[PDB]
DNA sequence: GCGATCAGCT
């Protein structure tokens, strides 16, 4: 996993805030997922913050909003500079101890992973580097990003720091964002139009990224999505108008430690079994990554798992095909995996990455 | 009381 430092610009720390990252001249957070926030509220970092008043955290506006909602991260309130998407911004890295100054230009590119998720393009004195954070990009997407180009061709990129979550030909293809939404939309419509007592439970992990499913179900079916908390989105109207804490809805994305046991007993996580004394009829839909081999005999994105239970294709991360297309196109001198998954090794990931780089 | 680690479990 990515220890926070790119070889070319070692005095900035991205998505890791512990150990050698405690000396960073500047911090960046690609997105508000716990995996990418290790050390970010360590007591030793809060202290260092009060000593070095020049050290800041840079992220997207959305990421800043989502981070400053959690009470454990309020000590950052005044030490976070949001940068707008697709907006080259010069940052003055200064060393406290030595007086050394360095200038670096950063561009945030949308990563398609969760609200506020960015890639960081860095341009300075030691080449051009791309840190992808976590990303999901359809085939061709890199070729349509203007700020990855100069004079209509791709920039000379020394190094790519790449989300390799599915970097194996096993995960050749994953159904697209649109096919995944469409499959869920139709299952949900087919159920909740049967009677006002037919309800769906969207069984989603407790992390940002399912918002676009809730948004699109809500738009297309005129029904707000029940959640536990929506206060993180209070200054974000384009998600918030699709959610509600009012349990009187046919679409639930509420959560509870015993939600499975609740489901066995025809109870929604927020605790209701009934409306006007009439029992609800619940189906559970569980977003779950599905993938297809190169032989393109793809199957339904909806998979029925029992009497009242479904899995639906959904992915936060690029397939193997999308990784290869993205890296192939950028043709950097170097590509470095942000993760080595449990099923593979640095050697096999590098065997995949090396042929897509220069020469 | 809190943090960091992990079994266990979604
Ligand atoms: Zn993530
Ligand atoms: Zn992750
Ligand atoms: Zn609910």
Author numbering: 3 to 361
Paste lines from the article.
Artemis (SNM1C/DCLRE1C) is an endonuclease that plays a key role in development of B- and T-lymphocytes and in dsDNA break repair by non-homologous end-joining (NHEJ). Artemis is phosphorylated by DNA-PKcs and acts to open DNA hairpin intermediates generated during V(D)J and class-switch recombination. Artemis belongs to a superfamily of nucleases containing metallo-β-lactamase (MBL) and β-CASP (CPSF-Artemis-SNM1-Pso2) domains. The overall fold of the catalytic core of Artemis is similar to that of SNM1A and SNM1B (2 Å backbone RMSD); it has all the key structural characteristics of human MBL fold nucleases, with the di-metal containing active site at the interface between the MBL and β-CASP domains.
A striking aspect of the reported structures is that both crystal forms were obtained in the presence of DNA and were reported to require DNA for their growth; the crystals showed a fluorescence signal supporting the presence of DNA (the oligonucleotides used contained a cyanine dye fluorophore), yet neither of the models presented contain DNA. We re-examined these structures looking closely at the residual electron density. The model contains an 8-nucleotide 5′-single-stranded extension with a short 2-base pair region of duplex DNA that reaches into the Artemis active site, making close contacts with the metal ion centre in a manner consistent with the proposed catalytic mechanism. The sequence of the longest strand corresponds to the 10-nucleotide cy-5 labelled strand (cy5-GCGATCAGCT) with residual density at the 5′-end that may be attributed to the cyanine fluorophore which we did not include in our model. The complementary strand used in crystallization was 13-nucleotides long and was intended to produce a 5′-overhang, but only two bases and three phosphates could be located in the density. The abrupt manner in which the electron density apparently disappears from either end of this strand suggests that this is the product of a cleavage reaction, although it is possible that remaining nucleotides are not located due to disorder. The analysis of electron density at this site is complicated by the proximity to a crystallographic 2-fold symmetry axis, which brings a symmetry copy of the DNA molecule into a position where atoms partially overlap and the extended 5′ strands form a pseudo duplex. The occupancy of the entire DNA molecule is thus limited to 0.5, and the lower occupancy is reflected in the electron density map which requires a lower contour level than would usually be applied. After carefully building and refining the afore-described DNA bound model, significant positive electron density was revealed for the second metal ion (M2 site) which we included in the model with the same occupancy (0.5) as the DNA. Thus, our model suggests Artemis preferentially binds DNA with a 5′-overhang binding at the junction between double- and single-stranded regions; the expected product of this reaction would be a blunt ended DNA with a 5′-phosphate.
